[PDB]
């Protein structure tokens, strides 16, 4: 038995998968997504 957090937030981008405490936060990063070139870190 180990710390087990489960960390969850009312925003959590699909495009990439990411989540932001706060919503600006989000749009600020969805403008990656909307703007060309939206795949950059995202590898798997
Ligand atoms: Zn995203």
């Known amino acids: 038995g180990s710390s087990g ?13 990411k989540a932001f405490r706060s919503k600006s936060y989000l749009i600020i990063h969805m403008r990656t997504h909307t703007g060309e070139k939206p795949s950059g870190p995202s590898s798997g």
């Open 5 to 17: 957090s489960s960390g969850v937030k009312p925003y959590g981008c699909s495009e990439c998968g």
